[PDB]
Amino acid sequence: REDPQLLVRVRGGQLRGIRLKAPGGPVSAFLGIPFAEPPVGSRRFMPPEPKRPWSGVLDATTFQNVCYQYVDTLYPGFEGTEMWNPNRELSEDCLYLNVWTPYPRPASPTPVLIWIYGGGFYSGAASLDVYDGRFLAQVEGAVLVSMNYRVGTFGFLALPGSREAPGNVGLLDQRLALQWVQENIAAFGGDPMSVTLFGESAGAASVGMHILSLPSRSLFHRAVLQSGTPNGPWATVSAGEARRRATLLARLVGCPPGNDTELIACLRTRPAQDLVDHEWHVLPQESIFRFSFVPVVDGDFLSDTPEALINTGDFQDLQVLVGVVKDEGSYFLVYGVPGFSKDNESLISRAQFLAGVRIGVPQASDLAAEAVVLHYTDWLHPEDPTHLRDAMSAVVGDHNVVCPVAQLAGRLAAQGARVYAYIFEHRASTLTWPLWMGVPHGYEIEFIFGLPLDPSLNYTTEERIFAQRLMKYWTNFARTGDPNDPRDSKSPQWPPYTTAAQQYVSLNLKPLEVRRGLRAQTCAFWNRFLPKLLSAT
Amino acid sequence: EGREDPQLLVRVRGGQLRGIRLKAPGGPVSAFLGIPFAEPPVGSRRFMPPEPKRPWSGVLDATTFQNVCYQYVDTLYPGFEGTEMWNPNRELSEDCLYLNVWTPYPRPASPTPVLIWIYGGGFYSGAASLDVYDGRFLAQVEGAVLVSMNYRVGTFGFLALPGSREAPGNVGLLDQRLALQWVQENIAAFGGDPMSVTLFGESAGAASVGMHILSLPSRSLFHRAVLQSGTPNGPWATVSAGEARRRATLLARLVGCPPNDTELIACLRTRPAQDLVDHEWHVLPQESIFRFSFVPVVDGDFLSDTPEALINTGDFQDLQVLVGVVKDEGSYFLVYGVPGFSKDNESLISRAQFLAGVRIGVPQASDLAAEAVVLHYTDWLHPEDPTHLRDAMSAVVGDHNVVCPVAQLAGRLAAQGARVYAYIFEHRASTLTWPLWMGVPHGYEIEFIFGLPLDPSLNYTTEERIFAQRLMKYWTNFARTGDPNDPRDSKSPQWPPYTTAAQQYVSLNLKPLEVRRGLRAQTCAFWNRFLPKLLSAT
Ligand SMILES: Nc1ccc2c(c1)c(-c1ccccc1)[n+](CCCCCc1cn(CCNc3c4c(nc5ccccc35)CCCC4)nn1)c1cc(N)ccc21
Ligand SMILES: Nc1ccc2c(c1)c(-c1ccccc1)[n+](CCCCCc1cn(CCNc3c4c(nc5ccccc35)CCCC4)nn1)c1cc(N)ccc21
Ligand SMILES: *[C@@H]1O[C@H](CO[C@@H]2O[C@@H](C)[C@@H](O)[C@@H](O)[C@@H]2O)[C@@H](O[C@@H]2O[C@H](CO)[C@@H](O)[C@H](O)[C@H]2NC(C)=O)[C@H](O)[C@H]1NC(C)=O
Ligand SMILES: *[C@@H]1O[C@H](CO[C@@H]2O[C@@H](C)[C@@H](O)[C@@H](O)[C@@H]2O)[C@@H](O)[C@H](O)[C@H]1NC(C)=O
Ligand SMILES: *[C@@H]1O[C@H](CO)[C@@H](O)[C@H](O)[C@H]1NC(C)=O
Ligand SMILES: *[C@@H]1O[C@H](CO)[C@@H](O)[C@H](O)[C@H]1NC(C)=O
């Protein structure tokens, strides 16, 4: 006997899902659905091709392979690093998606939530414990979709203008999963006419790039950008910079033994790990929060720079939820700034702070880095190691996340979008990173996905109530484009972010608190002053 | 003699003097007003260093104030007390090198600490005869010997053709140095202690005090110093030899003198004093506020290097300094040249009027530097709010010109061995006629330090009279000991020395002393550390 709730016919054929246990009851999971032809051999660096139909019933009960990527070995065996690392076999044959739906399958078309993972476009997988759609599906009755997209050289190595390596193919893999949803989600009880994209870090940048690319705009209705944006210093590169890095890596892998075709063909003959081995050696400077192969401003997927597109685009019929964590740049420091460690309090000297600023803002001139140091120094306690340590974290998170987010929020708002902004300030009771790291980058995700609801994970009762609140904000947003509950009449209400009032809310254990101005003075420094300083260079 | 008051007859190196017995609220004071300290700097002596006054015969009458040095008379708000109080109160003349002395009546039996006042007025104006500089209260109430002198201002005191013999520049500073030498020689005749001389001044007067700190020949003439809302460093207190040469040459052209220096200077000497005054303001390089045409020059003589170089490298080990600012240093300057500003309206300005004003307020700033200023002083929550824009314009002028040069000075002096005490004067006189938006303007602490509230006829409050008394004690305890704290009083909040480590200063208001940390620390790091690096690279 077969469970009819576990049998779905999609355009490509039949699938068999698995009944999964969530705290409050069962869910139907369809894991490892292929959405594209495996991008192997001659297909490496090429745009994805739709998956060909299959015979019989395809087993969709387990997560599929994780896209070929670099594996972090900074703190081996440490939960804090390991949780972000591949949890399935690495393979170039990784173009699969996952679907979680209520059990039984909803009777009416249900709003769809599509998750796009982060990991600096060099890493990530939709199989990670913190991306588990189980809770959202069970508790909120949502149809949750997550896909794997190619990362690193495989997803973003580009020789701009070539046919064989046009770049942005990882973004195309995501666009193909979005098309798959339009064509097949109704078979799972999902509403193709109510699709919300959500992502964190590189995932949030990806969401933004789908907002700014016209062929993606017909595939979703609302968007959520958690601690990431399409604009900013790390999310994109120029055609020139991508060409430079691709040519250098090819040179590094003894490739060619000339023409775009010749070079790409020889890169295709190379074992996956050979490309990963040299991936990090193509960065122009010693840096942090910089990734070798990221989306390219090609004049195709991205018709112009995200900055140009956000300044001139029409976002009238768009709803966006944007926000940041309390300590965006804290973890980045243990990956390359001398004096920083997870194992000590990381109390730094002034000299170490100045050195760290050159690493944190690698594009900055001597004058620009001096402007940064002078702005982030506490002139009452300018040598205080704690202030210097926290100022170093603030430099990295403001430059890379907070102020690009502030910039996106403002431009979207001014150009017709309905924007809701937040600051996530709750540190998980379960967190293993030091106290000095505060609420690091990515540690709100487990709360949005509702992991505290699993009693085995040992979160507090308040954290379980808080996770439930977040799941409601996110799904009310997916449902209506407003994170506020239409039933709840004693709130306080989450107001839209506007250029005039600059209103955002604090997300913590306490009830919603409304704040105005997202690091307004400091972001005027990054967004208004620093460009004028580098434009007169 | 024989029938005169024997307490009013004193001999100085120059000859005999007759003073006057004045009434102070608490009792009488001796006053010796209009004592000549130099040969009248007229004719061929115009632009020349002062010469010591030759001895006179008979009893020189020292019962009235003497002539005010030739200067521009402010006609912005005619008949208005707010402007008029700063204006000459005696006849204008180039024969103005006179000093005043106030002592207790009867004269002290033992050597008394001396306080020497140096007036402000952007080195273009001022007089030691102004009501707010009245030494009678300090003399009566604190038993102090108070001296104030006239020094040449404008072209007469500071027009220089650097390197020339006929117009070397800084002669107004030399007039001040000559009055300090006069005190060393003659103050003991009035009961004053030449071995305990404290200089005090406000605005250009405070800058003058600082220049005496930085000029070795003045250092032997005083022991302690008070710099109220002014410093030798900063954008307005000095000019380069090049800039002074440019302005003197242009002024000569504007009055009919065609440029060799001897010929030029000789011609300038043939010109009516009023003709120079009528063209004084036309030599400024840009439309500006808080900029004065003829100020001290970096000559490599009086000033061996720039005040900035001198404060960064000097040894101040055996020096005690009292420094401070008022709450609204730049507020009044805006009604003298920033469009949208008036004493008669609330001065609520637009963003465009703020951007325009920043260019007038920071005239030496490039487009990028002016942009850095605007971005720093804008409230990005309410960037178009007229009240914030108005107050930000005042803060730009006050911080650039006073607060941050003062902060720079306090830090450098402290790091280089000086004993520094810093303050913020936040009390607005109940009697003030300037609008409320101006807050505590530049120079409105003076009347409190001099103890004018003690005169009941001036209609100050009882709290203001108690407050004036507190200030007079801080200042005179500082003059006496180099510490503004009373050794008799105990908590009685202590005024701590300002240090690089703790950056401690006090609030001077009607409430008891409150200790604060950092003098506009973030903002002054912008002006003192960042902006120079922006103009050194662009
Ligand atoms: N082997 C080798 C050789 C040379 C270099 C490098 C590696 C690396 C490097 C890249 C990744 C991990 C470790 C090291 N960097 C890059 C260093 C910058 C930091 C990159 C980085 C590393 N990670 C970790 C990813 N995992 C996490 C993720 C998230 N949160 C987290 C919170 C805590 C800890 C880890 C988290 C949320 C989003 C998902 C990823 N995120 N960004 C270089 C920079 C140069 N200029 C030169 C040479 C190298
Ligand atoms: N006739 C004419 C022609 C051309 C110009 C000017 C005048 C003037 C000008 C100077 C003084 C008064 C009125 C106008 N400036 C303005 C520059 C300086 C004005 C700033 C100033 C004015 N005052 C008044 C002096 N008295 C005061 C003093 C103090 N506080 C005060 C508080 C309120 C009112 C007056 C105060 C502190 C102590 C000393 C003097 N002190 N500083 C120009 C700037 C240009 N760029 C170009 C041309 C001119
Ligand atoms: C904080 O730690 C860093 C890293 O040191 C490592 O982690 C420590 C907790 C401990 O296990 C050390 O032995 C490890 O080396 C310190 O910086 C390094 O210090 C070592 C000497 O101990 C030196 O050889 C390395 O070059 C340094 N590396 C870097 C990146 O700076 C740092 O000094 C520690 N800070 C404090 C406040 O103690
Ligand atoms: C304030 O005043 C400025 C100067 O205008 C003059 O003074 C005012 C008080 C009137 O008497 C007027 O007739 C004079 O011309 C103006 O430039 C400025 O715009 C005014 N600001 C406001 C907010 O009213
Ligand atoms: C939760 O706590 C219990 C009891 O201490 C422990 O046995 C269990 O392993 C913990 N679970 C996790 C996920 O750490
Ligand atoms: C003091 O007050 C009286 C009474 O109102 C008034 O006539 C006099 O002119 C005032 N004097 C001053 C200096 O304000």
CB B453 within 8 A of CB B467: yes
**Which residue, A279, A275, A343, is CA-closest to A74?**
A343
CA angle B493, B226, B8 (to 5 degrees): 105
Residue nearest to atom 13 of ligand 6 (CA): B458
Q: Which helix (H) or strand (E) holds B516?
A: strand B514-517
Residue A22: C-alpha distances to residues A4, A133, A410 (Å): 19, 10, 39
Counting ligand 6 atoms within 8 A of each CB, the residue from B432, B433, B459 with the most, and so the one to mutate, is B459
Give the span between the Cα atoms of B27 and B8, in whole angstroms: 16
Ligand 2 centroid distance, CA of B153 (Å): 14
Give the span between the Cα atoms of A243 and A47, in whole angstroms: 18
Q: Which approach determined this entry?
A: X-ray
Task: Provide φ and ψ at A73, rounded to 5°.
Answer: -120, 25
- Give resolution, Å, one decimal: 2.5
Residue A253: C-alpha distances to residues A213, A249, B69 (Å): 33, 6, 84
* A450 φψ region: left (φ > 0), alpha (ψ -120 to 50), beta (else): left
Give the span between the Cα atoms of B304 and B19, in whole angstroms: 40
- How far, in whole angstroms, is CA A392 from its chain's centroid? 23
The sign of the CA dihedral B299, B302, B308, B313 is positive
| Domain assignments of chain A as residue spans, ordered by start | 1-537
Measured between beta carbons, the chain A residues lying within 8 angstroms of B537 are 367
**Pure H helices in A45-201:** 79-82, 134-140, 153-156, 169-184
HSE-CB for A223 with a 13 A CA cutoff: 33
CB B526 within 8 A of CB A374: yes
Classify domain A1-537 by CATH number: 3.40.50.1820
The answer to whether B378 contacts A524, with C-beta atoms less than 8 Å apart, is: yes
CB A79 within 8 A of CB A340: no
Distance from CA of A503 to the nearest CA of B (A): 10
Q: Is B282 a known active-site residue?
A: no
Give the span between the Cα atoms of B211 and B123, in whole angstroms: 13
The answer to whether B525 contacts A379, with C-beta atoms less than 8 Å apart, is: yes
Give the span between the Cα atoms of A389 and A347, in whole angstroms: 6
Provide the residue type at A459 as one letter: Y
| Test the B interface: residue of A372, A373, A374, A402 with most B CBs within 10 Å | A374
Classify domain B1-538 by CATH number: 3.40.50.1820
Number of CB pairs < 8 Å for A and B? 42
**Nearest chain B residue to A523, by CA:** B380
Give the span between the Cα atoms of B396 and B376, in whole angstroms: 10
User: Could you say which ligand is closest to the alpha carbon of residue A343?
Assistant: 3
Residue with tokens 């996905």: A449
DSSP string of B453-507, one letter each residue: GGSGGG---HHHHHHHHHHHHHHHHHHHHS--S-SS-SSS---PPB-TTT-EEEE
| Test the A interface: residue of B355, B380, B399, B527 with most A CBs within 10 Å | B380
Give the span between the Cα atoms of B39 and B81, in whole angstroms: 34
Ligand 5 centroid distance, CA of A455 (Å): 10
**Pure H helices in B195-237:** 204-213, 216-219
The residues, any chain, with a CB within 8 Å of residue B188's CB and separated by 6 or more, are: B111, B194
Grouping H, G, I as helix, E, B as strand and the rest as coil, residue A422 is: strand
Distance between terminal CA atoms of chain B? 71
Residue B529: C-alpha distances to residues A525, B522, B523 (Å): 16, 10, 10
**Which residue, A147, A48, A36, is CA-closest to A100?**
A147
**Which residue, A62, A65, A84, is CA-closest to A73?**
A84
User: Could you say which ligand is closest to the alpha carbon of residue A335?
Assistant: 1
For chain B, breaks with the C atom over 2.5 A from the next N come after: 259
Distance from CA of B516 to the nearest CA of A (A): 11
Q: What ligand 4 atom has the least distance to the C-alpha of B353? A: 19
Give the span between the Cα atoms of A171 and A110, in whole angstroms: 26
Q: Which of B371, B518, B530 sits opposite A380 (nearest CB)?
A: B518
Residue with tokens 């140091």: A373
Give the span between the Cα atoms of B230 and B398, in whole angstroms: 11
Token pair listed for B389: 């824009």
